[PDB]
């Protein structure tokens, strides 16, 4: 191994073509890894977009008593899911649904921004930006 | 085999019903077969 | 006519049937004599019981407790006779629970219960119960908060029937009728029950019309050991739990232990640490959360030892 | 069906009966025992916990 | 990925490399795709091992506590019962 | 929501029929041991 | 010069003084031997201890627990010798507490402690302790999290001194120096202590420079009974609590009970239910809220009974 | 308070009064100032009695639980100790 | 008399200090006077 | 006072020492006992709870 | 007693002057009882007014962190006092002080109106009406 | 709030003086038994 390692190091140091072959392979891989990240981010972005779209189909309660009850249930559902790191998307959706039902979203955002963990807030923040209808 | 049994025993809408029914079947057999009297007494 | 009634009654008596007992007792051997469910508690408890007589029965009891949903103090008194039994117990908060059972006939009994709470108007309640015990069957009708003040029958009514089909098999029925408010329609539910009983083992089932099923099996494992298994299924979501447990009858102590499919483990040890004193230790362990509830209690009966000349009154309608 | 005046009077009977049972039921049981027990205990001992 | 871009690293030298750089070159020998894919499997495999040990540990705790909570009171009650049987038998 | 008056009458009839069906079963049970006796005597 | 040193040392030895022991022990007879404070617990607990040797001492212990702030499991191992003692215990969550005591000289001891928690970076800590035990005094210096990485001394440092003034009276001193961050000034606190000790009774006091005063009295009430009272005053608001308790030493059990001016009552009963098994029952009752905490535990030492041929190693630096 | 205002009740009759009114007249006999002042003292006195009973009851509970929690374990431990002393003395 | 004692014992800023100090004085006297040995032993 | 590079290296030693003590301290104690105890226990019995 | 009661009843029924003397005494007392209630209400009103005045002298925190900390402390103090029926005035003062520090008093009022008991709300409601500076 | 640099130097001196006063007491205690001996011998 040492003889090969010495030859490999010697070739890399003194042979420019050997570096060029390796550098080309590394640069090619660097492109794939960045492209893979962007694909993963878009898929995550799609999930966030999908979650906001799903909330529109179920609809929201209209009466004050149902809105408060639904809000509490959504807050309770979001909080219950917030403890599980695998439900951050679902927890944010409950917080998003509740935020859309709460009469003063801006105040509730300040509560979530301080009481909800940042990983969930990051998804919820994009949900607010994606749902341009949120006041 | 296992795929058709594990799903219906731990990751199904009735998983809790199946576990309770199976456990009862074992417990009764353990008692009625006389093994319990030979072990617990 | 008596001609057919006498012939029918005679043919009935020659069948060798026997009274199967109350419907609520078809699972007693498991749910009360083996499982710990009815004995489990938490915190500290102390019962000081004074017996003043055995015929008529009369005893007064002071209970001190400090634990989950246990009232700090409870004073209870009871009086009994072969024809009647009256009991009342009151908490430090004034909640009074009472019982008054009277035998109008050896085969017919009236049971009256009250629960008067000063703090809550909803809590106050009254339950009237009538029981008949034939040679081979039992019939019962209950009326909880029966009222006609609104111009229509309201409250909760329950009818229970259990019939011995053969010397070992018993089949029964239960019916409920409810009307919480005259403005809403009455709700009725029916439950079917049955039991097969033998010296060594007993099998019972309780099927609700709602779909829930409760089944149990009890078997004796010798003179000092007996065990049973109880299963409950609900289809309100689908959920079910099965409990297996055993009971040991030693000379100075009784040990009960059980475990169920939800991962809970519990045990109860009652030990006669002295002639008038009995200790109780209860522990309930939830293996899914690793939390345990510990209960320690004591019972003292000073009066009974110093009055052996009169024996307990017979057939007190407890 | 039922007269409104009658419902008021009938409800009043429950209210009175509730209070009487709340206060009178336990002393009644103690009275029955004290006079019918064999033997008859002392008034002080009647509610002594263990003496 | 252009021959002119890679050609910028026309010259290199063994002495110019720093000790940290020479040590880093050892890691450069392994293909990044394989090492990246091996590291991924390593995380998944290491997580499974930790999950197995947590489950095995949690199961042993359950059996240990169950045997103690039931075996201890029973052993004392059963032992005391035998003494009464012995004393009664000696009569 | 609150029920309509005709729906209440429908419920009242339904409830009565259920309890009547129960009492019909109780009568069958009371007569059941004689039926069970015949089966043992049929063979 | 040795001429004065020898004459001084000789005059000192002829005074009949004795080593008063660690400052932290001036109230041991009350706060640990009589009061329940150090034994109280809640829930269920089980310690399974296996002794593998007595010289050198080596034993391994598994603790199972289910209660308030009790870790579900704790594995502990220790090794001891007349010159050293090493112990480590780890929770199910990986919190590792360790001790390593070494006798560089019979009168000089180094004690090292660590507390490594994976979950919290704040929790991790290290405590270095040095003790000297003269013929009539004890001196100690501690360094908790000592660091100079910021270019200045930081952490917590404690110095303790206790001197026997006469065969019965002991007077002492304690000093603390702290600097949590180089950006803020150092904080120093001093505490004065003293004790008067006799065969029948012991009196102790601990005065903080902050104004708080802790005083205690211990007295023996015969060969099987001893009792003590402990008082604590704080002037941070003005608050004070006084605890009175007694301890009974029966053959197979030790009973401790105490009550204090805040209305709390607690008792601990340790009973040798078997030769290797010891039970513990603890109950703490708060009379102002009527709430009680019940604790039941057990200790098992299988190894010790089967190896009587080697006796415990002397002066293990516990 | 005008003679003309009070004069409006010029005529009254014994039969015109209803049973409830005739019963209410009995309460009218007592001066309202005294009855109002007596009722006030009654509330204060009744409250004090309830406070005294609550305190007396709460004190008795404390003594009962204290004696039990301490007397019960001690009585068992002390009793068992005496048995060992008796058995050892019989040797 | 009582007015000057009850106030300083239960409704004063140092009421908790006085109660703790007085209780300690009694406890020590109860032990040291030999009454405790005559009752608890 | 102290060089910034030195503080990084010194801090690294604590980080490494912390991990070693976390993993190595208990096995070390078990090793000392197992080799120096009188008698020497079995590897299986060395951590058996009561057998 | 019965003879006097019969004579008293007979006199009241047949003697108008006897009724007039009694009626005058009853009417005179009726005035005093109503006047006493008004005096009690004004004294209670003065206590409410006094409580609002006292809050102005202590002042309120200006920083956001102190306002939130003070708000939580006032809510905690108000809630702790709200459990004692003798501290309803002090509890309302803490809720009033907090309400004055909260950024959106209208939303907090809806919380208090539903979470705080009516006896405290009645005092707090008058405090809001008395403190015309509350937004 | 954060302390000023001159206040820190004042605290550092104060802290040092306190510990120096403690060590002065420890020296007195170490010498205290000989002092107590003299008192018993003065009479
Ligand atoms: C003879 C003495 C032994 C038997 C005692 C029987 C007591 C029967 C009930 C007494 C009244 C309870 C009551 O009013 O409760 C509501 C009241 C509620 O407060 P209140 O009285 O303001 O409200 C009453 C409300 N109405 C009128 C609608 C009913 O609660 C209490 O008074 C609290 C104490 C209840 C009882 C506590 C236990 C019994 C007393 C101690 C044990 C007996 C002596 C032992 C020695
Ligand atoms: C014996 C006399 C009859 C009962 C006396 C009063 C008992 C009161 C009670 O404990 O509960 C009230 C109960 C019911 O009280 P209710 O019908 O006034 O309803 C109030 C209680 N909830 C809301 C829970 C229904 O007493 C009765 O049921 C009285 C009617 C039956 C009379 C026969
Ligand atoms: C026998 C097989 C198991 C041997 C011990 C394996 C310990 C593995 C482990 O990490 O356990 C953690 C578990 C607890 O797992 P846990 O998941 O509850 O907590 C750890 C959580 N993390 C990993 C995030 C920090 O340990 C126990 O519960 C105790 C295990 C030992 C039980 C008693 C053994 C001796 C007596 C027989
Ligand atoms: C799992 C439980 C394990 C308990 C721990 C081990 C117990 C060891 C007993 C040793 C002993 O003294 O044996 C006495 C005897 C051995 O002796 P013997 O009595 O069989 O015969 C000898 C008799 N003499 C001495 C008179 C000649 O063993 C038993 O009888 C054991 C019976 C089983 C008891 C197990 C505990 C209760 C089980 C209840 C089951 C119901 C569900 C429980 C759910 C929770 C548990 C899963
Ligand atoms: C020889 C076997 C007996 C002695 C065992 C000694 C164990 C020493 C510590 C082991 C590692 C603990 C650890 O890494 O904790 C942090 C980890 C935290 O999770 P982590 O490993 O992801 O984080 C590590 C973080 N750094 C690298 C910064 C330290 O916790 C655990 O692994 C949980 C289990 C801790 C130990 C549980 C008890 C000991 C095992 C059961 C008893 C022994 C066997 C009995 C039969
Ligand atoms: C023995 C070797 C020296 C200690 C090794 C590391 C021990 C680490 C530990 O348990 O706590 C870290 C501690 C302190 O860690 P630290 O100084 O990095 O600070 C982090 C911890 N807090 C925030 C709580 C202060 O170790 C030391 O004190 C190391 C310096 C002393 C060396 C002598
Ligand atoms: C002896 C003097 C006391 C005799 C009993 C007096 C009971 C008075 C009462 O209402 O007590 C309520 C108290 C509790 O008072 P409390 O105030 O905690 O609860 C009642 C609250 N109200 C009134 C609002 C409903 O009762 C007890 O704590 C038990 C009292 C009896 C203790 C044991 C006596 C027998 C053994 C000796
Ligand atoms: C208050 C506590 C009351 C406890 C209940 C009554 C106990 C009755 C004992 C009966 C008995 O067997 O007596 C044995 C003996 C009587 O016999 P004897 O031992 O004195 O003499 C006879 C000896 N023989 C038989 C061998 C000839 O009494 C005692 O020794 C009693 C001592 C007092 C024990 C009280 C409980 C512990 C007290 C601890 C005090 C410290 C503070 C506690 C704070 C909480 C309590 C306030
Ligand atoms: C409907 C659900 C499905 C599971 C279940 O019900 C619920 O189905 C039941 C079938 C039962 C068994 C039937 C027959 C026997 C043979 C007998 O052996 C002595 C026979 C003797 C003849 O001479 C000597 O051979 C011992 C008992 C045993 C094993 C029963 C055990 C309990 C079982 C398994 C029941 C079990 C709980
Ligand atoms: C309302 C529901 C109806 C079912 C049920 O209630 C609920 O009612 C009981 C009917 C019982 C069975 C009836 C008869 C026998 C034959 C017997 O044979 C032993 C030998 C013997 C006769 O040959 C001679 O010794 C073995 C047991 C078995 C199968 C019973 C099992 C339990 C059952 C299923 C009970 C069950 C709980
Ligand atoms: C595997 C896990 C660890 C180990 C463990 O399971 C779980 O294994 C169980 C075996 C049990 C013991 C069996 C028998 C007895 C004798 C009895 O009688 C004494 C009478 C007296 C007369 O003088 C002396 O002989 C006292 C109790 C004791 C020691 C049991 C204690 C609990 C033990 C240790 C249990 C323990 C928790
Ligand atoms: C730093 C603080 C200084 C005080 C203190 O620490 C704190 O230091 C101790 C000094 C003690 C007293 C010293 C001497 C005696 C004389 C003795 O006389 C018995 C007879 C005997 C001699 O004549 C012959 O038998 C009775 C007791 C008494 C008063 C001590 C009481 C407790 C005291 C106050 C202790 C207290 C805790
Ligand atoms: C005033 C309040 C109510 C009553 C009460 O205080 C509070 O009064 C205390 C007196 C105590 C008892 C004194 C002595 C014994 C004997 C002992 O030894 C049995 C040995 C065995 C040998 O075979 C049989 O002799 C068993 C326990 C017992 C009965 C005590 C129990 C607890 C009691 C009842 C306490 C109880 C709580």
Numbering used by the authors:
A (entry chain L), K (entry chain K): 22 to 156
B (entry chain H), I (entry chain G): 16 to 56
C (entry chain B), G (entry chain A): 21 to 256, 265, 267 to 347
D (entry chain J), J (entry chain I): 21 to 71
E (entry chain D), H (entry chain C): 28 to 118
F (entry chain F), L (entry chain E): 8 to 50
Manuscript excerpt for this entry:
The translocase of the outer mitochondrial membrane (TOM) is the entry gate for the majority of proteins imported into mitochondria as precursor proteins, or preproteins. In humans and fungi, the TOM core complex is a membrane-embedded dimer of twofold symmetry, consisting of two copies each of the β-barrel Tom40 pore, the α-helical Tom22 receptor, and the small α-helical structural subunits Tom5, Tom6, and Tom7 (3). Two other preprotein receptors, Tom20 and Tom70, are loosely bound to the TOM core, forming the TOM holo complex. We determined TOM core and holo structures with and without the bound MTS of rat aldehyde dehydrogenase (pALDH), revealing numerous interaction sites with the Tom20 receptor and the Tom40 translocation pore.
Applying 3D variability analysis to the same set of particles resulted in two unique classes of the TOM holo complex that exhibited a major connecting density above the cytoplasmic face of the Tom40 twin pores. Joint refinement of these two classes resulted in a C2-symmetrical map of the TOM holo complex at 3.2 Å resolution. Likewise, in our 3.2 Å resolution structure of the symmetric TOM holo complex, two copies of the Tom20 receptor interact with each other at their receptor domains and are stabilized by the cytoplasmic domain of Tom22, consistent with our previous N. crassa model. The symmetric Tom20 receptors extend along the membrane plane and rest above the twin Tom40 pores. On closer inspection, we found that the hydrophobic binding grooves of the Tom20 receptors are oriented toward each other. We refer to this as the “handshake” conformation, in which both Tom20s rest at the center of the complex. Symmetry-relaxed refinement results in additional densities corresponding to the preprotein pALDH caught in mid-translocation inside both Tom40 pores near the hydrophobic pocket of the Tom20 TPRs. In the difference map, three elongated densities occupy the space inside one of the Tom40 translocation pores, suggesting multiple preprotein binding sites. The longest preprotein density interacts with the loop between Tom40 strands β2-β3 on the cytoplasmic side of the pore, suggesting a possible entrance contact site, in accordance with previously published cross-linking studies. On the cytoplasmic side, the preprotein appears in two positions as it interacts with each Tom20 receptor domain, between helices α4- α5 in one case, and α3 in the other.
